[model samples]
Target: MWPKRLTKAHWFEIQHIQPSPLQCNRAMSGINNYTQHCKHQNTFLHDSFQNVAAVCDLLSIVCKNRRHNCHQSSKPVNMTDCRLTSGKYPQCRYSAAAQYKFFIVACDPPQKSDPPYKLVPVHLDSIL
Candidate 1:
């Protein structure tokens, strides 16, 4: 579920979120399953931006709006993949794909300590 190439920076945000190093290893199972995920060119900040197509590991993220105030982490369990089709606001279509993907995460910052890391407020595609 990701590209063949990666760097330390790509793993940095996700690594610390793990309760232990063991869990981090388990979370990487899909790393090989990942294909070449692409970035969505449009940036309207749709209400649906939080909808993630898949819980793909990560690319990278922080919050410009929140900076230090934002606790949002693009960890695997906390994200939303926006699916609204390309078009004008108030009018759009739904799109899907097996190969196309990107990553982001949002959190209610609730309980943890497990694989496929899930918590509150985390949705697809968009990060908190």
Candidate 2:
């Protein structure tokens, strides 16, 4: 069975939280090397995990994937969007664009294995 909180944690590391605007080519390749594939597009949030997790307390809304548990941040957050530019798997390349915008994320109630959080962001729904 797929892990719940563990997957959520991985999502945070690979797709969300980042301290700065690191090169997408390097970051994406780092992740791809582990998964053995290239990620076409990704966004890194330049915010603390707790700060983003707090967004889960915001009002719920429809997600890009049609889920209803998504929450949009009350304020715009700093982030970087990474898109694949060229190169094949493993050698994947990417382009990064920094942005400041409100973002939406899907949250779920904590399971037994999760940290002490009422709700935790598991999916990055969209950015506005």
Candidate 3:
């Protein structure tokens, strides 16, 4: 389960958190917390994107830079388990698993206007 603080997306609008692609530009091309060679093999990236009660792809949003529109979706986890694999490369390889976390999910075309308390985040209880 997820917290209402997130599911409601209230704080975001309350603080007017700009969903700037600039932030993403600064984002890494891949995993940023662990190493592909993290031989421990127990964990990779931090558990920051896993909540069925969290934002869904369809309900995701983005900043409006209509000119350079490169919208996105899905909450990604920094996968590690890439080094000692068949590839034999010293690089981080991401994998998917069930872990509850928090993250941003961008939307395509970027949402034109703000919804505020109107079309706020949809609930997962009834739908799921």
Candidate 4:
């Protein structure tokens, strides 16, 4: 059984991308609030990525920016991508018993004539 209150210190190492203690505190604020906030951001990132990849080829953009690419047949959560673990509660901080998973979300590269593109989250998973 898990304790009622979990500190950032308790889950720092497992973080997909670690942040300074101060940074983590600012992001998390409080345990209950952070949990809810993390869930919403995770969902948004997942959904946005899925929508973009489904239409990448149609967009006629190579999506050369590896930073935001998610067209792979199988996407694994990489620790380096700050976005995956940027918010208050990254996957690593998810309750151990919950077994959560996060996916990389990105948008098609903008045309040479267009401005910069923004990547979006497409999907998330949890074994529990």
Candidate 5:
């Protein structure tokens, strides 16, 4: 069977978009627990899915990958950056730093089985 592109959105949800500031060690470990590996660096957006999804309606721009499917949010949003501290694998440890910045995400049309949206973010391009 063909891979579902919707998984990108689901992965993004789990990896980023924590509406609250959860401690980095526990939060990062939770993520590693799900994937069974350490993610060296990660970022979370302290905003609702609805607000982040709405960015798709903004003008499209070139992505870091040189694709024109990315869109930038109109305003800065609360964010947290997590970096691997020392642990590895299931013992993943991380340090959290809070920030506020504008972000960009790559969007694409949703599939029939995907969440009902005119467009959905599939890749976190960058945070400005």
Candidate 6:
């Protein structure tokens, strides 16, 4: 399961894995019972950063560390929902809504020997 706490970037990283396109479509298609979903279909149930990170961290594939930056795409998936317009990465064909009943994939961060340093998301109430 994913860690309950994650940084905004890590949250975004998780979000990128399961783009809103796939989540919304899944809701519309009735493939999943929930009103909305996040994380790859596989990790959605885990519902914790620790679980989610464990899955990704264990993968044979190694990702590189790059200064996180945002790149916008011209194609908008949901113009009606302005919130969807701005996200971690710019929209792209691969980034488009998931057309199939499968998990969306994110580009690997630049290759690195160590796991990327990420901030954990903290509940606002916890700040007090």
- TM per candidate: 0.23, 0.86, 0.18, 0.21, 0.90, 0.23
Q: For model 3, how does the per-residue alpha-carbon lDDT over 1-78 read when each residue is reduced to its tens digit?
A: 223333333322322222222122122212222222323122223332223213443444343433221123244543
Cα RMSD of predicted structure 1: 15.7
TM-score of 2: 0.86
Which parts of model 1 have CA positions greater than 4 angstroms off? Answer: 1-61, 67-93, 100-102, 111-128
Residue 122 of model 6, lDDT score: 16
Report every candidate's CA lDDT. Answer: 0.31, 0.82, 0.28, 0.31, 0.84, 0.28
* lDDT of the structure predicted as candidate 1: 0.31
- In candidate 4, where is summed lDDT lowest over 10 consecutive residues? 119-128
**Pairing residues by index, what is the TM-score of model 6?**
0.23
Q: List ranges where model 6 is wrong by over 4 Å.
A: 19-114, 117-128
RMSD of each: 15.7, 3.2, 15.2, 13.8, 3.4, 14.5
Highest lDDT among the candidates is held by which one?
A: 5
Q: Which candidate model has the greater TM-score, 1 or 4?
A: 1
lDDT score, candidate 3: 0.28
Across 1-128, the per-residue lDDT of candidate 5 in tens digits comes to: 22334377766766777777588887777667666689899999999888888999999999999999999999999999999988757888888889999999998887666688999888889999
Q: What is the lDDT of residue 120 in candidate 1?
A: 30
- Using TM-score as the measure, the top candidate is 5
Candidate 4 lDDT over 19-83, as tens digits, reads 22223333333433545455322221222223334433332212335343433323333222122
Q: Write the per-residue lDDT of candidate 2 for residues 7-122, one digit (tens) a residue.
A: 66556655678778588887676667656788888899888888888999989999888879999999998899999888889779888899999999899987665677889888
What lDDT tens digits, residue by residue, belong to model 1 across residues 8-103?
Answer: 323333322322213222333233124222223221212222233122233334545443212332332322232444444323333432222233
